[PDB]
């Protein structure tokens, strides 16, 4: 078992609690980067190496722009950190306490939330016995974006081109 | 497992180096030594004031083009398909639309830094 | 959606082939005449908004308004009649197929039916 | 004429209804246009819909 | 000897920022005619740097 | 359902509650918006990889692409707001009222 | 904005909506919503000013939140069924999330504040496109998934929409905010009938779109954005004021005008399903909308407000641009009550 | 010549007038033919005439 | 919400007046809490103590209205020995309206609230008796 997926999921939730308590965009980006790396680990354990590395790389690139933007647009004299503010620390502690409570309840008994029913057992239990051979199912399914999914490529490329046009138009001014 | 052990080893070695650096030498600290550096004179303002970014549009375009390359990365596996003509058409379609985005921004002066 | 997804429905078909067995609307239908009246009113409003003589100017334009409205109204009436015929057909077929749900009841005369009398005074 | 027609029959139905509608209109439309405020309202609505609707 | 038509008092009662003003809504003001608010005199605050002597 | 799905859904709920509760900066809310799509990506790929839905493996990539488009749109609006008002504070977006 | 870029952005908005309407896959529906929003932001920001920037920011924030909630609902539904097709949703929690997201997109209460704020922020053409097309898409999705809609949640949001629209419109004195609150009320009516007859939903959508197009185009023709600005139009073109008054009477639901047909059909359809309290409350609450329509009609056509001295020069000059299909919208929004049984063709 | 400036609609636009009249005539003859064909097809399908 | 309504309706009409008052008080308190939450969100208070004071005032007003309505309705039904009578609910509704007027310190608000709440409560009793439904299930 080793509970590696559960530990990683808990760290994922912790990073979300951080950047959602919202200290300041520098530390929000730091927490989001931690969460992206940990999610890469979770999906690597579940099987998708390409998907994990891709989401990690995309969020590393995206948060690089956010740093430059918060240096220019979203900075103040004394940037707030988690312990610097009463509201930020309160929200951070609330999120951590909620995560701890739900984790403890799930481990102690099969916890049914007011939304969904969860069973405390093995993420290794839920896996499938069967195997593939001499190819990666994830890689083949992703590579099927060009043979299958011609429509998806068309709409995605159109959206990206129009996105360039839009960002040029919004920031025109005048 | 092995990769986790490798990451742990690297982080532990770096942290030990920091610990040795901050605890081995003799330390003498006073307000003048730890003051911020600005070539011998005091800083007029603060380093936390807003710092204008003259390439704000190139950054957004970088986000979009970064996800374009994310789309392009699974091409080596896409070359093993039986639908080679469709695969080649869609790959060239994505690359041509990327080129069109670059051409549009270049001609509309999106690549020029603000003055 | 009552009749959406009815079996044998061709998507995006304004008028199916089975609608050809219904009587087409007469060209002097009062509904067609009202569609033409709507076209004429649109033409008069066009002249009024553009500040031309309302009744006199743009006779060709007013004719085009009336003709377009009559054309579209004719096809709309055909589709409406087809949908109503389809509804009645389905209802009759279901009643025929479910006799236990739509039973024929024995008719009793008012000489046999007893009704309470409520005097007005 | 005065007490009933001009005063009390006027107060019961049309004056009271108009006053209530005007007050509720002021309450609804008196907003500062702050996204923080009405997004907090959205959060409350979402929690209520998740919990009290089954 | 002629039909009554609205005057400046009527028009001004209809020309506020909102109907039914309160304290806050009276502190409010109607928007500009061309929807363009006057520019705000923000401070650019260029970074000041000591380039030298060391 | 495993506890992993519970944690991912909890992370999404936390990021949604973060977005709906602004403090001052528009950038922090944008970061909360980017976290929600990260949790959506992780949840979708966990569901797809477990069930061996081979043709659905491309869906998280499209999800990421439109996350990028949303982030670009939000950053463009943020630079326009900052140009107008000097700060990315959400208190300045009060000209329009309900 | 370059005319070519503007028309390609309009076409992209329309393409996103059409993708939403023709797709059978939840991912493609989400893609359509995203494409619509992305191309719709610059249209709002077409005339650059702080109000337009603020309106675009608020619209983007609301629509991004709604799209995120919608994708969460889609993924939750996939978890419990493994189905990507848009049909009845297999999870009540996913259905509740989907209903909340689509209501936030449409502006149903309590998700309505952005509607008056954004509409006042943006120009008349942008508001016309916003109301019409951006109501056109989510309602199609709701009609597709209607058979799993929670009647209690849908009807609660519908009654809230009707009440809020009436009250806000009562208070407002700006024409664009009046239009926005009227839009909120009409969306309330449509979604109230939604869990019983999507055909009646479509009929109300079409009539509302016609009346809104006529009203917005009359405002654009008269170049009036406030009550007092619209009070000068009787001294320039008294025909436009009369047409606007008839259209306002139609919007308020007075017989025998075309605005009575949707309310009539919806009341009848809900009564067939043994609903009486809801139709009666809905019918009585529309008197608020009629009141502020009539207040607007007093200022512009039924009374003559004071004018200014430069109106003489305006008399000397003539209106150049011609509105496309304005007479047709005026006629369709007022005189098509005797054509009611064509809703079977609409079926 | 009353107007100091030539009105935009001083003279009829003969191209537009011809197109309008042609479109109206085409629509009318098409409607007549469509109705005749509809009546004939209905009678043939129902076995009336 | 549904659980609270089920408890209130599961207590019989003319019996257990203390339990009826408790259930109606709980329902009123929940309604007041929801109203106070929306008021806090949409009109922020100047301080945490002011927010707590406003929440307490709204919650206590709603709870008092609910308690008075339930107690008065049950007692009236018990003493008259006529359950399933809309007059009991009308009396409870006017008592709740008088409670609202007392909380707001306004005779006019009290009178209007008595009238409107009495009509509403009598209508609710008539609906329970006759089978009226507000959110009707789709059919036909
Ligand atoms: C995969 C990793 C997963 C990790 C877990 C999950 C993380 C999720 C995201 C983050 C969520 C929140 C994290 C905890 C926040 C705690 C609250 C807080 O405000 O702390 C204070 C502190 C803020 O203080 P500051 O303003 O920087 O310092 C001024 C002092 O307050 C001025 O006061 P002072 O000067 O009197 O105090 C001095 C003292 C103050 O020391 C501290 O505050 C130590 C705090 C350690 C927190 C560790 C967690 O500092 C020292 O003595 C120096 C040595 C200690 C600091 C350096 C080493 C830290 C541990 C590494 O918080 C932080 O700086 C947060 C750092 C979080 C780092 C997490 C790991 C980063 C990894 C990056 C690469 C990732 C790659 C991809 C994977
Ligand atoms: C969907 C998913 C949902 C969530 C699911 C779970 C996952 C997430 C878990 C959390 C993870 C972290 C993410 C959350 C991030 C939060 C955040 O960024 O907040 C920023 C946000 C604004 O930041 P800021 O602008 O820098 O702060 C300005 C200062 O607060 C300025 O200070 P001030 O001088 O202006 O006054 C301070 C304070 C003053 O505060 C007040 O006036 C509120 C007083 C409430 C008293 C309640 C008493 C009753 C308690 C319940 C009933 C008990 C039973 C008895 C019956 C009642 C008896 C009275 O606040 C205000 O004045 C601002 C007014 C607006 C906010 C008020 C608080 C929330 C309103 C909505 C709920 C209202 C509940 C009312 C009671 C009814 C409950 C059913 O902060 C807050 O709203 C407060 C601090 C954060 C607390 C978060 C706690 C967790 C929330 C979830
Ligand atoms: C086609 C036809 C259709 C129908 C047509 C007619 C339509 C209706 C017509 C009008 C009837 C409804 C009137 C509604 C009540 C007034 C609403 C209002 O805003 O009042 C403000 C006004 C107070 O205004 P404020 O400025 O907020 O407070 C300053 C006052 O000075 C504060 O007052 P104060 O401190 O100077 O002293 C006031 C004191 C004065 O004491 C009384 O008024 C007690 C009168 C006892 C009965 C005396 C006559 C005995 C014979 C009666 C008839 C017997 C045969 C049946 O009254 C109270 O304290 C009232 C509390 C409750 C006492 C119990 C009796 C009620 O309220 C009153 O004066 C309440 C008087 C209520 C008298 C009974 C009214 C009829 C009740 C419903 C019958 C159905
Ligand atoms: C207003 C002025 C005009 C008033 C006209 C008179 C209306 C009388 C209707 C009474 C009636 O027959 O009630 C049905 C119903 C008939 O019995 P039933 O066959 O067992 O049906 C209930 C089922 O057990 C369970 O039925 P269900 O689960 O299908 O639905 C019952 C409904 C709860 O049932 C009701 O709400 C109706 C009964 C209580 C109504 C009390 C106030 C009267 C309001 C009438 C107009 C409603 C407009 C709603 C607009 C919402 C947005 C503003 O609960 C829900 O739908 C749960 C989720 C939504 C709750 C509401 C959240 C938003 C409320 C916002 C406004 C406050 O009455 C009850 O069950 C009474 C239970 C005890 C209630 C307290 C005493
Ligand atoms: C290459 C990368 C890794 C580098 C690792 C370390 C490299 C260097 C190894 C040799 C270091 C020799 C000792 C230097 C200590 C600093 C000198 C100093 O501060 O002197 C002034 C001070 C003077 O003290 P004082 O008491 O006279 O002064 C009082 C203060 N004032 C000046 C104001 C009067 O020296 C000391 O305090 C002496 C402390 C003990 C020195 C020996 C202990 C360290 C032994 C190191 C052995 C190697 C293993 C452990 C080290 C880590 C590596 C694994
Ligand atoms: C030049 C002559 C004049 C032309 C003027 C043209 C103006 C109108 C343009 C034509 C509009 C209709 C397009 C006709 C071809 C499209 C065929 C297709 O769209 O028709 C059907 C659908 O068409 C429309 O739905 C109905 C067309 C009729 C609408 C106009 C009348 C609306 C009723 C108003 C009554 C009161 C006003 C009366 C008119 C004045 C297909 O059904 P289906 O693909 O499966 O629908 C799936 C979705 N559903 C099931 C939920 C509905
Ligand atoms: C039913 C129609 C017939 C019954 C109509 C009820 C009217 C009874 C007497 C009302 C006359 C009271 C009055 O004049 O004012 C109305 C007075 C206005 O408030 P004030 O400004 O404080 O008082 C003004 C000074 N008098 O009362 C109100 O209209 C406010 C009512 C508060 C909310 C009403 C409760 C509604 C709850 C039920 C909703 C379902
Ligand atoms: C000039 C201004 C615009 C008005 C133009 C009106 C054109 C009308 C004529 C169309 C061409 C004639 C035609 O094709 O007629 C064939 C058909 C005759 O009907 P049919 O069924 O053959 O008759 C048998 C039973 N009598 O014709 C028909 O069936 C046509 C009837 C359909 C409805 C036509 C519109 C009705 C009138 C609306 C108002 C327009 C007239 C206003 C005149 C104002 C004058 C100041």
**Which of A9, A95, A116 lies closest to F14 in CB terms?**
A95
Q: Which residues contact C38 (CB under 8 A, 6 or more apart)?
A: C69, G331, G332, G335, G336
By the 8 A CB rule, do G190 and G138 touch?
Answer: no
Q: Following DSSP, what letter does each residue of C13-67 receive, concatenated?
A: -SS-GGGGGSPPPPTT-HHHHHHHHHHHHHHHHHHHHHTS-TTTS-HHHHHHHHH
- The tokens describing G4, both together, are 């070519």
C44: which 2 tokens?
């008069």
Do G118 and G176 touch, CB atoms closer than 8 A? no
Residue D33 in contact with partner chain G when CB distance is under 8 A:
yes
Q: What are phi and psi of G174, to 5 degrees?
A: -95, 140
The CA-atom distances, in angstroms, between C49 and each of G239, G321, I9 are 7, 12, 63
Closest approach of D29 to chain E, Cα-based (Å): 9
Residues of chain I in contact with residue G270, where contact means CB-CB under 8 angstroms, are 136
Instruction: Identify the CA nearest to D39 among candidates H33, A127, A160, F16.
Output: F16
Q: Which of A72, A139, A144 comes nearest B51 by C-beta?
A: A72
What gap in Å lies between CA D22 and CA G166, rounded to an integer?
11
User: CA of E31: which chain F residue's CA is closest?
Assistant: F95
Q: Helix axis angle, A150-170 relative to F59-85, nearest 10°?
A: 10
Count how many Cα atoms sit within 13 Å of the Cα of residue C96 in the half-sphere of its side chain.
Answer: 6
Nearest residue of F to residue B71 by CA position?
F61
The closest of G239, G164, G179 to G209, measured between CA atoms, is G179
Compute how many other C-beta atoms are within 10 angstroms of the C-beta atom of residue G166: 26
Exposure string for A39-75, b = 16+ CB within 10 A, e = fewer: bbbbbbbbbbebbbebbbbbbebbbbbbeebbbbbbb
Token pair in block for residue G108: 């149903």
The whole domain housing B47 covers 1-108
Closest ligand by atom to G97 CA: 2
Q: Residue I14 to residues G174, I74, I78, I123, I129: CA-CA distances in angstroms?
A: 54, 6, 5, 18, 14
Q: How far apart are CA G161 and CA G186, in angstroms?
A: 8
Helices and strands: H and E segment counts in chain G: 16, 0
> Ligand 1 atom closest to Cα of A15?
8
Q: Which two tokens stand for residue A74?
A: 């979203």
DSSP symbols for E3-49: -----HHHHHHHSSSSSS--HHHHH--PPPTTS-PPPP---------
Mutate to test the interface with G, among A160, A170, A173 (most CBs of G within 10 A): A170
Decide if A19 contacts A28 (C-beta within 8 A). Answer: yes
Pick the residue from chain G with its C-alpha nearest to C84.
G344
CA atoms within 13 A of residue H15's CA, in its CB half-sphere: 0
Q: Which CATH class is domain F3-92?
A: mainly alpha
Contacts of residue A155, defined as CB under 8 A and 6 or more positions apart, other chains included, come to: G19, G28, G31, G35
Place of tokens 């609270």: I4
Separation between Cα atoms, residue G205 and residue G163, nearest integer Å: 19
3-class secondary-structure state, position G226? strand
**Alpha carbon distance A122, G73 (integer Å):** 26
Q: Tell me how far apart the alpha carbons of residues A22 and C96 are, in angstroms, rounded to a whole number.
A: 68
> Which residue, B54, F82, B46, F79, is CA-closest to E47?
B46
CB A167 within 8 A of CB F76: yes
| Helix, strand or coil, per DSSP, at residue B38 | coil
Packing angle, helices G277-297 and G260-272, rounded to 10: 170
CB G21 within 8 A of CB G137: yes
Question: What are G289-295's contacts with CB under 8 Å, separation 24+?
Answer: G289/G165, G289/G166, G289/G169, G289/G182, G289/G185, G289/G251, G289/G252, G289/G253, G290/G252, G290/G253, G290/G254, G291/G170, G292/G169, G292/G170, G292/G172, G292/G178, G293/G182, G293/G248, G293/G249, G293/G251, G293/G252, G294/G248, G294/G252
Q: Residue for token digits 């001295």?
A: G309
Name the residue at shortest CA distance from atom 44 of ligand 5: B24
SS3 of residue A85 by DSSP: coil
| CA gap F20, A49 in Å, rounded | 33
Contact G37, G15 (CB under 8 A): no
Closest ligand 2 atom, residue A95 Cα: 11
Q: Transcribe F32-80 into DSSP letters.
A: HHHHHHHHHHHHHHHHHHHHT-GGGGGHHHHHHHHHHHHHHHHHHHHHH
CB contact under 8 A, B71 and F65: yes
Query: Rounded distance, CA B2 to CA B5, Å?
Result: 5
Task: Identify which of A29, A11, A28 has the alpha carbon closest to the alpha carbon of residue A91.
Answer: A28
SS3 assignment, position F25: strand
Within its chain, how far is the Cα of F25 from the centroid? 15
* Cα–Cα distance measured from residue G308 to residue G306, given in angstroms and rounded to the nearest whole number: 7
Q: Rounded to an integer, what distance in angstroms lies between the CA atom of residue A74 and that of residue I18?
A: 58
The technique by which this structure was obtained is: cryo-EM
- CATH assignment at residue B59: 1.20.58.1610
| DSSP one-letter code for G25 | B
Q: Could you tell me if I100 and I69 are in contact, meaning their C-beta atoms sit under 8 angstroms apart? A: no
Contact of I20 with I7, CB cutoff 8 Å: no
Give which of G337, G313, G347 is closest to G202, Cα–Cα: G347
Helix (H) or strand (E) holding A174: none
For residue B113, is it within any domain? no
Closest listed residue to residue G189, CA positions, set G177, G171, G174, G202: G202
* Token pair of A28 as six digits: 């929000």
The tokens describing C111, both together, are: 């000489």
Q: Tell me which ligand sits closest to the C-alpha of residue B23.
A: 5
Q: Which residues contact C72 (CB under 8 A, 6 or more apart)?
A: C35
Helix/strand number for chain A, H first, E second: 6, 0
CB-based contact F14:A13 (threshold 8 Å) = yes
Q: Give the distance from residue I133's alpha carbon to the nearest chain G alpha carbon, in angstroms.
A: 7
In chain I, what is the straight-line distance between the N-terminal and C-terminal CA atoms, in Å?
29
The number of the ligand 7 atom at minimal distance from the alpha carbon of I109 is 27
B4 C-beta closer than 6 A to ligand 5:
no
What does the DSSP assignment read for G41-67? HHHHTSS-SHHHHHHHHHHHHHHHHHH
Residue identifier of the C-alpha nearest atom 24 of ligand 4: I6
Strand partners of residue G174: G226
Contacts of I3 (CB under 8 A, 6+ apart): none
* Ligand 7 touching residue D18 (CB < 6 A): no
With vertex at residue C34, the alpha carbon angle to CA C32 and CA C35, rounded to the nearest 5 degrees, is: 65
Query: Among residues I114, H35, D15, I118, which one has the least CA distance to residue C32?
Result: H35
Nearest-CB residue to A173 (from G38, G41, G48): G48
Q: How many domains does chain B have?
A: 1
Structure tokens at G238: 């008294």
CA G66 from chain centre, in angstroms, equals 18
The token pair at G69 is 């909630």
Report which protein residue has its CA nearest ligand 1's atom 59: B15
Residue whose structure tokens are 């103590």: I49
Please say whether the beta carbons of F67 and F34 come within 8 A. Answer: yes
* SS3 at position C121: coil
Nearest residue (by CA) to ligand 6, atom 40, is G336
Q: How far is the CA of H28 from the centre of ligand 8 (A)?
A: 10
Place of tokens 């980006």: A29
- Cα–Cα distance list, G151 to G154, G264, G265 (Å): 5, 20, 19
Inter-residue contact G73 to G46 (CB < 8 Å): no
Torsion, Cα B33 B38 B43 B48, to 10 degrees, reads -100
Q: Ligand 5 mean position to B12 CA, how many Å?
A: 22
Q: Testing the interface with H: which of C22, C62, C66, C67 to mutate, by most H Cβ within 10 A?
A: C67
G334 Cα–ligand 6 center, Å: 19
In terms of Cα–Cα distance, which of C13, C63, C42, C28 is closest to H27? C63
* CA G203 to chain CA centroid, nearest Å: 13
CA-based nearest residue in chain C for residue H18: C60
- Residue C14 CA to residue D20 CA, distance in Å, equals 50
Q: Whose CA is nearest to atom 27 of ligand 7?
A: I109
Beta-carbon contacts of G140 under 8 Å, excluding residues fewer than 6 positions away, are: G20, G21
Distances E6 to E2, E12, F47, G315 between C-alpha atoms, Å: 13, 10, 68, 22
CA distance G192 to G190: 5
Looking at the complex, report in whole angstroms how far the Cα of residue D39 sits from the nearest Cα belonging to chain F.
Answer: 5
B23 touches ligand 5 (CB under 6 Å): no
Cα–Cα–Cα angle for B29, B32, B36, rounded to 5 degrees: 105
Q: State both tokens at D18.
A: 């108009």
In a 3-state reduction of DSSP, which class is residue A117? Answer: strand
Q: Which residues contact D12 (CB under 8 A, 6 or more apart)?
A: none
Helix (H) or strand (E) holding G107: none
- Residue A112 phi/psi, 5° resolution? -105, 110
Residue I42 distance to chain D (closest CA, Å): 5
Q: ω into residue G22 within 30 of 0, thus cis?
A: no
Which positions ≥6 away from G30 have C-beta within 8 Å?
F66, G67, G70, G71, G74
Q: Where are the domains of chain F?
A: 3-92
Buried b (16+ CB within 10 A) or exposed e, A114-150: ebbebebeebeeeeeeeeeeeebbbbbbbbbbbbbbe
Check CB contact under 8 Å for G104 and D42: yes
* N-to-C CA span, chain G: 41
- What is the per-residue DSSP string for G228-244? HHHTTGGGT-HHHHHHH
Task: Quote the crossing angle between the two packed helices B56-72 and F59-85, to the nearest 10°.
Answer: 180
Long-range own/partner contacts, residues I21-27 (CB < 8 A, 24 or more apart): I21/I67, I21/I70, I21/I71, I21/I74, I22/I70, I23/I70, I24/I66, I24/I67, I24/I69, I24/I70, I24/I71, I25/I63, I25/I66, I25/I67, I25/I70, I26/I66, I27/I66
Query: What's the Cα-to-Cα distance from F37 to each of F58, F66, G229, rounded to whole Å?
Result: 15, 9, 46
Ligand 1 centroid, distance to F24 Cα (angstroms): 23
Query: Any idea what the Cα angle at residue C29 is, between residues C23 and C30, rounded to 5°?
Result: 145
Cβ–Cβ < 8 Å for A65, B59: yes
CA distance G207 to G337: 11
Flag whether residue B44 sits within 8 Å of chain E, measured between CB atoms: yes
Quote the CA–CA distance of F12 and B33 in Å, as a whole number.
46
Nearest-angstrom CA–CA distance, A82 and A95: 12
What DSSP state is assigned to residue G85?
A: B
Burial C90-120 (b: 16+ CB within 10 A, else e): eeeeeeeeeeeeeeeeeeeeeeeeeeeeeee
Report the half-sphere exposure of G9 (CA within 13 A, side-chain side): 26
The verdict on the CB of residue F6 being under 6 Å from ligand 2 is no
Q: What are phi and psi of F89, to 5 degrees?
A: -65, 145
φ and ψ of G33, to 5 deg: -60, -45
Q: Tokens standing for C103?
A: 């039973």
Nearest to G137 by CA among G13, G232, G3, G27: G13
Burial of I84 (0-12, 13-18, 19+ CB in 10 A): exposed
Closest ligand relative to B28 C-alpha: 5
Q: Which residues pair with G25 in a beta bridge?
A: G85
Pair of tokens at residue G183:
């839009």
I42, D41 contact by CB (below 8 A): yes
Cβ I94 under 6 angstroms from ligand 7: no
Show residues of chain E in contact with F84, CB under 8 Å.
Answer: 40
For the Cβ of I107 lying below 6 angstroms from any atom of ligand 3, the answer is yes
Instruction: Give me A36's structure tokens.
Output: 């992206």
Q: Is the dihedral of CA C88, C92, C97, C99 positive or negative?
A: positive
Q: Six-digit token pair at C41?
A: 């009113």
Q: Helical H runs in chain I?
A: 2-10, 17-42, 48-80, 86-104, 107-130
Q: CB distance E31–G305 less than 8 Å?
A: no
Q: CB neighbours of A42 closer than 8 A, spacing ≥ 6?
A: A5, A8, A9, A12, A52, F4, F42, F46
Taking CA atoms, A128 is separated from A122, F49, F51, H4, I89, in Å, by: 12, 10, 9, 89, 61
Residues shown for chain A: 174
Q: What's the rounded Cα separation, in Å, for the pair A69 and F25? A: 12
8 Å CB contact between E45 and F88: no
Q: With respect to residue B96, please indicate whether it lies within any of the assigned structural domains.
A: yes
Q: In chain A, which residues have their Cβ closer than 8 Å to the Cβ of D46?
A: none
Judged by CB atoms closer than 8 Å, whether chains meet at B39 and E45 is answered as no
Beta-carbon contacts of residue G284 (< 8 Å; ≥ 6 apart): none
The radius of gyration of chain C from alpha carbons, rounded to an integer in Å, stands at 25
Sign of torsion over alpha carbons C67, C72, C73, C78? positive
Q: Are G196 and I138 in contact (CB under 8 A)?
A: yes
**Which residue is closest in CA terms to ligand 8's atom 6?**
C63
DSSP G299: I
User: E28 φ, ψ to 5°?
Assistant: -65, 160
Residue having the nearest C-alpha atom to atom 32 of ligand 5: B26
Question: Which residue in A69, D33, A164, E25 sits closest to G54, CA to CA?
Answer: D33
- Residues of chain B with Cβ-Cβ distance to A69 below 8 Å are 53, 56, 59
Say whether A158 and G12 touch across the interface (CB within 8 A).
Answer: yes
CB I86 within 8 A of CB I102: no
List of chains touching A (3+ CB pairs within 8 A): B, D, F, G
Q: How far apart are CA G309 and CA G332, in angstroms?
A: 37
């Amino acid at each position: 078992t080793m509970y590696i997926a559960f530990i990683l999921s808990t760290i994922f939730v912790i990073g979300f609690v951080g950047f959602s308590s919202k200290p300041s965009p520098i530390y929000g980006g730091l927490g989001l980067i931690v969460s992206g790396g940990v999610g890469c680990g979770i999906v690597l354990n579940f099987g998708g190496s390409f998907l994990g590395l891709m989401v990690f790389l995309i969020y590393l690139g995206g948060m690089l722009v956010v740093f430059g933007y918060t240096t220019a647009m979203a900075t103040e004299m004394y940037p707030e950190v988690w312990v610097s503010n009463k509201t930020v620390f309160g929200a951070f502690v609330s999120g951590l306490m909620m995560e701890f409570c739900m984790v403890y309840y799930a481990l102690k008994e099969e916890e049914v939330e007011i939304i969904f029913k969860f069973n405390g057992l093995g993420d290794w239990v839920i896996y499938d016995t069967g195997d593939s051979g001499f190819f990666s199912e994830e890689a083949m399914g992703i590579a099927a974006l060009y043979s299958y999914g011609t429509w998806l490529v068309i709409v995605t490329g159109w959206s990206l081109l129009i996105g360039v046009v839009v960002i040029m138009e919004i920031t025109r001014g005048n | 497992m092995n990769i986790m052990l490798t990451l742990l080893t690297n982080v532990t070695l770096a942290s030990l180096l920091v610990l040795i650096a901050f605890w081995l030498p003799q330390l003498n600290a006073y307000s003048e030594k730890t003051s911020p550096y600005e070539c011998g004179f005091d800083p007029m303002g603060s380093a936390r004031l807003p710092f204008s970014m003259k390439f704000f549009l190139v950054a957004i375009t970088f986000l979009l083009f970064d996800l374009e390359i994310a789309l392009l990365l699974p091409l080596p596996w896409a070359s093993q398909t039986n639908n080679l003509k469709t695969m080649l058409t869609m790959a060239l379609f994505l690359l041509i639309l990327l080129a069109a985005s670059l051409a549009y921004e270049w001609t509309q002066k999106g690549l020029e830094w603000a003055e | 959606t009552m009749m959406s997804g009815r079996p044998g429905r061709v998507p995006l078909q304004f008028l199916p082939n089975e609608a050809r067995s219904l009587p087409p609307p007469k060209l002097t239908d009062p509904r067609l005449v009202y569609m033409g009246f709507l076209g004429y009113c649109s033409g008069l409003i066009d002249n009024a908004i553009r500040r031309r003589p309302v009744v006199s100017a743009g006779l060709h334009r007013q004719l085009l308004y009336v003709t377009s409205f009559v054309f579209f109204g004719y096809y709309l009436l055909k589709r409406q009649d087809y949908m109503y015929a389809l509804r009645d057909h389905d209802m009759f077929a279901y009643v025929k197929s479910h006799p236990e749900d739509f039973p024929e009841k024995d008719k009793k005369t008012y000489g046999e039916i007893l009704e309470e009398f409520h005097p007005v005074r | 004429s005065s007490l009933l027609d001009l005063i009390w029959l006027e107060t019961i139905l049309p004056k009271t209804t108009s006053f209530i509608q005007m007050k509720m209109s002021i309450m609804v439309s008196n907003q500062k246009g702050l996204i923080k405020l009405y997004f907090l309202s959205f959060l409350i609505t979402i929690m209520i819909s998740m919990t009290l609707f089954n | 000897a002629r039909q009554w038509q609205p005057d400046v008092e009527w028009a001004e009662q209809f020309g506020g920022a909102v109907m039914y003003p309160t304290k806050e809504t009276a502190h409010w003001k109607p928007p500009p005619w061309n929807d363009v608010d006057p520019p705000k005199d923000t401070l650019v605050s260029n970074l000041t740097l000591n380039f030298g002597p060391q | 359902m495993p506890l992993v799905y519970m944690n991912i859904i909890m992370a999404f709920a936390i990021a949604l509650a973060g977005l709906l509760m602004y403090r001052s900066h528009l950038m922090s809310s944008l970061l909360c918006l980017e976290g929600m799509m990260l949790s959506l990506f992780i949840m979708s790929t966990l569901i797809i990889l477990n069930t061996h839905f081979t043709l659905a493996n491309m869906m998280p990539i499209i999800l990421l692409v439109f996350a990028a488009c949303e982030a670009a749109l939000g950053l463009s609006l943020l630079v326009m707001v900052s140009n107008t008002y000097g700060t990315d504070y959400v208190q300045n977006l009060n000209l329009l009222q309900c | 904005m370059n005319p070519i870029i503007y028309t390609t952005l309009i076409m992209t908005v329309m393409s996103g909506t059409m993708l939403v309407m023709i797709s059978s896959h939840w991912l493609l529906i989400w893609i359509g919503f995203e494409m619509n929003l992305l191309a719709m932001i610059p249209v709002l920001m077409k005339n650059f000013n702080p109000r337009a920037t603020e309106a675009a920011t608020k619209y983007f924030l609301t629509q991004a939140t709604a799209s995120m909630m919608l994708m969460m609902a889609i993924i939750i539904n996939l978890l419990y069924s493994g189905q990507w097709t848009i049909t009845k949703m297999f999870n009540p929690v996913a259905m509740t999330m989907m209903t909340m997201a689509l209501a936030m997109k449409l502006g149903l209460s309590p998700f309505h504040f952005w509607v008056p704020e954004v509409t006042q922020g943006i120009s008349l053409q942008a508001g016309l496109l916003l109301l019409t097309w951006q109501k056109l898409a989510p309602l199609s999705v709701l009609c597709q998934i209607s058979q799993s809609i929670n009647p209690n949640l849908m009807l609660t949001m519908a009654m809230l929409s009707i009440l809020i629209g009436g009250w806000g419109g009562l208070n407002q004195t700006q024409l664009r905010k009046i239009m926005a609150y009227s839009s909120i009320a009409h969306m309330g009516w449509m979604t109230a009938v939604l869990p019983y007859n999507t055909t009646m939903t479509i009929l109300n959508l079409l009539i509302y779109i016609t009346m809104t197009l006529a009203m917005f185009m009359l405002l654009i023709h008269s170049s009036a954005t406030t009550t007092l600005s619209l009070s000068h139009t009787w001294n320039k073109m008294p025909v436009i004021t009369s047409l606007m008054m008839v259209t306002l009477l139609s919007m308020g639901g007075l017989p025998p005008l075309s605005g009575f047909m949707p309310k009539w059909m919806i009341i009848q359809e809900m009564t067939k399903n043994e609903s009486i309290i809801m139709p009666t409350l809905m019918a009585m609450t529309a008197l608020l909308n009629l009141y502020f329509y009539m207040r607007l009609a007093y200022s512009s056509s039924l009374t003559m407000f004071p004018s200014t001295n430069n109106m003489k020069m305006k008399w000397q000059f003539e209106h150049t641009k011609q509105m496309k299909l304005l007479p047709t919208m005026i006629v369709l929004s007022t005189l098509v009550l005797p054509m009611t049984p064509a809703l079977s063709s609409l079926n | 010549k009353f107007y100091i400036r030539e009105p935009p609609h001083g003279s009829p636009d003969w191209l537009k007038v011809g197109l309008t009249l042609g479109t109206s005539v085409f629509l009318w003859i098409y409607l007549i033919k469509q109705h005749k064909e509809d009546v004939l097809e209905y009678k043939r399908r129902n076995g009336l005439e | 919400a549904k659980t609270l309504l089920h408890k209130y309706s599961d207590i019989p009409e003319g019996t257990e007046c203390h339990r009826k008052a408790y259930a109606s008080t709980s329902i009123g308190g929940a309604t007041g809490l929801i109203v106070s939450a929306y008021s806090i969100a949409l009109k922020p208070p100047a301080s945490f103590l002011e927010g707590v004071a406003r929440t307490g005032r709204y919650t206590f007003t709603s709870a008092a209205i609910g308690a008075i309505f339930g107690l008065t309705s049950c007692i009236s039904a018990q003493v008259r020995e006529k359950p399933d009578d809309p007059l009991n609910y009308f009396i409870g509704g006017c008592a709740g309206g008088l409670t609202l007027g007392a909380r707001t310190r306004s005779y006019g608000i009290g009178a209007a609230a008595c009238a409107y709440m009495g009509l509403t409560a009598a209508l609710v009793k008539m609906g329970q008796l006759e089978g009226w439904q507000v959110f009707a299930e789709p059919k036909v």
